[PDB]
């Protein structure tokens with residue numbers, strides 16, 4: 001017995017088609033949350049037989065509505081949500097000392113953690129982020145709370161307790177090398193002990209990690225076969241800082257790679273100043289990049305050249321990087337990635353820029369690949385889990401104005417782009433993770 | 443007999459202070475719609491005597507609300523709103539051929555015009571744009587319809603019938619030189635004849651303007667003492683195309699200057715490729731620039747160096763440039779202007795970037811000056827018109843989540859920025875133009 005059968009239009013990406021619009025198709029969802037069939041509505045009779053459903057069980061979408069896959073945020077600091085949107089007109093250092101560290105440090109209080117984490121999980125779900133790869137804080141128990149919160153709301157997630165044994169600017173926010181190693185093993189073990197269906201722990205070296213701790217986190221990830229998340233070559237100062245602290249290493253990428261932290265389950269945020277040779281290394285190891293356009297521009301870090309990454313066959317997703325990037329919305333990330341690629345065209349760095357459709361793919365299929373999840377989610381193939389968002393361009397109080405020509409013909413050039421460019425949570429009517437409807441909230 | 447007395451927080455700009463926050467102040471508005479007084483709420487007793495009102499005529503704003511000035515869009519094509527947000531992933535000339543020109547051409551149909559024009563005026567108003575400087579089409583009667591629509595809704599505006607006697611790229615959309623002059627004289631005349639309180643005609647040379655039409659449009663502006671608006675130095679190809687079509691002249695700027703189209707009532711959009719010598723002329727003439735950041739990026743045009751424009755003491759505001767820029771929101775224009783300044787910092791063109799507060803000044807007081815309306819609007823100086831927007835960060839379904847700390851102390855570094863970076867029409871509770879409440883709509 002299928003949990004759902006939907007009739008209408010479906011918009012997703014494949015590896016040979018940035019955006020595929022499937023009009024008047026039927027889509028079935030098994031009791032276990034999987035995509036069971038997807039075919040033109042003409043095949044209704046044959047399917048009603050093959051799958052033993054009656055026509056009255058079909059939910060007919062409005063011709064104005066369309067489904068698309070859940071958005072995949074490959075990099076976001078859940079613990080930075082409370083001041084996201086505040087002044088960034090401040091040297092990075094002061095930003096860290098005034099906002100970031102005091103905020104994250106406050107997560108020793110379980111009630112502050114509960115407040116913020118509940119809020120950021122709700123907020124990102126209602127904006128269509130079905131999968132989120134979160135940075136939390138150095139606090140094991142609070143980070144465990146985040147995981148518990150994402151599972152309660154039904155969001156797919158990686159949750160990473162942060163690790164740092166270096167912090168000159170805010171000495172109170174950090175661990176001893178030994179405390180960090182121990183608390184990471186505890187965090188991972190207590191996560192796993194929970195038997196969560198769609199939340200997993202991830203090894204998360206923070207900004208300020210000694211070489212001994214680096215090697216030890218490497219070891220943890222290796223012996224437990226864990227995902228890894230970190231920041232890499234975000235800005236010129238951070239690049240110089242790592243050359244000084246690790247002078248024996250040829251580059252930032254080598255610091256991670258030689259310490260067991262650059263693996264085929266590794267995602268690395270930013271990458272603005274990676275070299276071509278470093279991208280080759282990423283390819284070989286099967287490590288991914290999380291493109292964080294808003295943050296890179298908002299904090300004047302630099303420009304990730306997404307075309308070069310693509311040329312090098314490096315896995316790549318989009319991220320939000322709350323709060324470095326001020327917006328919690330992957331729609332904003334799509335818009336900003338498009339613009340960053342435009343910037344490199346104007347500057348004659350590249351010969352072309354990325355299409356909205358290409359960035360739509362990165363925000364969904366691309367992100368899921370970067371997280372090693374493209375076998376389960378990312379587009380509407382058969383067997384994958386139903387992670388999807390129902391878009392109504394014409395919803396109550398829509399920020400979109402629609403005119404004759406928006407709803408017929410090549411809609412992939414009209415209403416669909418009007419949503420990506422101008423839509424917001426008002427257009428996101430329903431959200432599904434693993435076939436279960438998670439928005440509207442219960 | 444005062445029209446409104448408001449008690450609460452006021453946020454605006456002055457020429458000495460990018461953002462001034464006036465907490466728990468009192469503001470009076472006359473029946474003529476002028477700001478009669480603005481003072482600390484302790485002065486309530488004196489002011490009530492001074493201005494003969496009882497204290498129950500005072501409206502107390504919520505503690506989570508503040509007024510700021512209306513936003514001033516110094517450049518927008520109302521006639522392009524119907525396709526705003528559709529594909530821009532094609533060469534510029536194809537975009538013009540496929541989208542821009544067919545859409546404007548359609549404005550021969552007065553119902554289509556009414557439809558589109560009604561929608562954009564309503565949309566911009568509900569997003570806090572209290573003053574808009576519109577491009578319409580070459581059609582005189584339809585442009586007059588726009589003016590009448592702004593007047594109906596209460597939006598302060600300039601309306602420009604477009605003038606082009608040249609169009610190789612889309613020949614169905616153009617005028618004869620002679621027709622363009624006569625129909626411009628008629629547009630100006632028929633609009634003035636309306637006796638509009640708040641809308642004025644603006645001489646609008648389009649892209650596709652002969653030298654003969656150029657000098658004649660100048661004459662019309664000079665003898666009629668009219669405002670002028672055009673595009674200048676938007677992209678590298680346009681700069682070059684101008685070298686060819688006008689080999690006589692030194693540059694893009696002289697072309698206009700020598701034809702009486704560079705005056706102390708002139709606004710010029712984009713200016714991405716204006717030299718320093720050209721900015722000096724702008725200064726001497728008192729000509730303004732409309733910075734259109736979303737457009738410059740969306741169309742991969744270039745970057746306006748706003749820091750250099752200001753150094754040359756050229757008047758400058760922000761524009762949305764629908765549909766070149768896909769967003770109708772001046773909030774988006776603020777966000778994009780900040781990011782363009784960051785790009786120049788990142789590339790080391792500039793040693794610093796603009797602050798949100800500086801860009802907020804541009805969006806209001808700066809834009810009002812570019813339009814020559816800074817004596818009547820733009821901030822909360824006594825005697826100005828009450829063009830204002832009531833902001834509620836905690837509105838129903840608010841895109842912003844607030845946390846303890848957001849609404850006290852230096853809020854100019856907190857909620858105010860959160861609204862500016864993350865807010866939308868849901869937070870804009872009421873809009874006032876000339877002291878008249880124009881939003882919510884009757």
Ligand SMILES: [Zn+2]
Nearest residue numbers: 077231269321
């Ligand atoms: Zn980050």
Ligand SMILES: [Zn+2]
Nearest residue numbers: 519711763766
């Ligand atoms: Zn324009």
